[model samples]
Target: LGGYVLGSAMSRPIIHFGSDYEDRYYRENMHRYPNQVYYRPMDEYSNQNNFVHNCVNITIKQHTVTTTTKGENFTETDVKMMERVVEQMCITQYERESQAYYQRGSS
Candidate 1:
């Protein structure tokens, strides 16, 4: 059912997330999550092999953080942090898609 909505949205542009641009973005990238195979387990070999793999490890140092209301002011650090958060969200989506594919295959 959810696929129907996304597939239809892909066919004809629709307003999503309160804007057409955001809707188009998701329509294009719905299945193309970044680092897709990395979140997938080795047991799902078929899907993993379908994509080129580029895995890397990095460490992020923690520092004291505080929140404030800057009144619509945005910073580069804030954008970077949001990008990292979205990347993690996409990783989670890849894991979900892998599991969904596995279940369909099993059935």
Candidate 2:
């Protein structure tokens, strides 16, 4: 949602302030991140009842920009950022759909 995108953008400066230990913790345990730059939130990470406790220290930054007379194309950086963010969004969206099935006791 908009809030998630805005919050993520706003958290970038704070993320820059994180300690090495915090970075390491996120690197080691983030739900679907394959490297230091990407994160995909898994079911266990976003569930209201089962969210990862240690994930509180982590935030991902991804901005979706709209072009106007000031811009012509999205940059390579934008593409990469979108890849990472969309991965998380995809997983989060999947988790939402999955919970419905789980609640229904359907396989």
Candidate 3:
């Protein structure tokens, strides 16, 4: 699976939005989903991707950041940079750890 495809299905977190909301969100943000749910395929599409990516995505989302929580919509440049750095670091760790996870196991 593509790395992004792997992560999104896991991170978009189908739970946050149930099937109803997922389909609704999917319609608006179809570009965000690799497996379209127009028909009945997304179940398998999601289940299959989840078989692997779920574990991987959880590994990161539930890592250090899991301990953190929501904050205000900061208007300060300093705060913006702080958010940027956090996401960057999150992705950096995600990519590096996941890269090894995929390679070490899949290989």
Candidate 4:
């Protein structure tokens, strides 16, 4: 039902001091970790070009939540429960695709 445009701008200096003109905001906030997910270098890291896109759609059928992305008809169980099942399905797919980009050996 929603989407986002994720990107980075790398024109200015990487390190910049704060209002006090003494605190190095960029230097202090920018740190690299072995297995961290964020703050990675755009050039040698993932999502560098930054035009990645992702979306999701949901539908319900016969009081059961229907999955459109997979197009697989789930059983007609309790209406409330089926809705949750479909919600979970969408989240799992979203998580897989979102994380794959940052995994090792992926571009």
Candidate 5:
């Protein structure tokens, strides 16, 4: 269900955190970016390939980070931290995008 929302947002422009211009920025990217993995887990399937280049690339949906990393497993709390990190990434990305828009220099 959650993935569906992401998928729809990607296909059909949704409200952005920044100005209206943000949609064009993303839409153009989708035109250039391959959308095959937009809804897939941010795991080997993605890492094997890569940014925040697209939406699904934004989060490290560590559903099995430990298994893949061979390190200490992420506790539930750590999972929440993982969420925190993703939120930070989004906020910062938007922050920059919005700020850039305000500059009125580039499109």
Candidate 6:
């Protein structure tokens, strides 16, 4: 069901944030960015590898400070913190895409 909606092109993400700076300045300005930051590389089975480029490598900016450098030395609390950090970043990106989808239709 979700895949169908996404495939339709009509059901895009919509941003409902109250801040004008985020809605107007940030969101409106992102369209001018020539390169796609949120890139999903197609599977190797898909023969369309000609579109691959070296530009704009995805950089994970977060610094994970671990107590031990060897094995999994993280406590349950530490694991939870890492999970939250990852989920927060992913959800934000999802929201941004949704907003772009909604705006494309409205405009």
- The whole-model lDDT of each prediction reads 0.32, 0.37, 0.35, 0.31, 0.39, 0.33
Models 1 onward score TM values of 0.25, 0.26, 0.21, 0.22, 0.30, 0.24
Model 4 lDDT per residue over 24-86, tens place? 432332331011111222324335233121111223322222235446554333333333333
Cα RMSD to native, each candidate?
14.6, 13.2, 16.2, 19.8, 15.5, 15.4
Model 2: which residue pairs collide?
none
Q: Which ten residues in a row have the lowest lDDT in candidate 1?
A: 56-65
- lDDT (tens digit, per residue) of candidate 5 on 1-107: 56522322123322233435544554543343222222334434444224343343434442343346455454564344334334334434346655755687743
Q: Which prediction has more favorable TM-score, 1 or 5?
A: 5
As for lDDT, the candidate ahead, 2 or 3, is 2
Q: How many residue pairs clash in each candidate?
A: 0, 0, 0, 0, 0, 3
Candidate 1: give its CA RMSD in angstroms: 14.6
Q: How do the residues 33-56 of candidate 3 rate in per-residue lDDT, one tens digit apiece?
A: 222111122224466445343333
Which candidate's TM-score is highest? Answer: 5
Clashes of 3: 0
Considering only N, C-alpha and C atoms within 3 Å, which residue pairs clash in candidate 4?
none
Candidate 2: what lDDT? 0.37
1-107: candidate 2 lDDT, tens digit per residue: 32232223211221231457555544432332322222235425455533532232233332223334335455564344334543444344346755775586744
> Candidate 6: TM-score?
0.24
Better-scoring candidate (lDDT), 1 or 5: 5
Clashing pairs in 3: none
Candidate 5 Cα outliers beyond 4 Å, as residue runs: 1-58, 62-67, 96-107
* Predicted structure with the largest lDDT when compared to the true one: 5
How well is each residue in 3-91 modelled by candidate 1, as lDDT tens digits? Answer: 11111112212212445655455554443322211222322344443422212111111111112222343346443333343334434
lDDT-superior candidate, 2 or 5 = 5
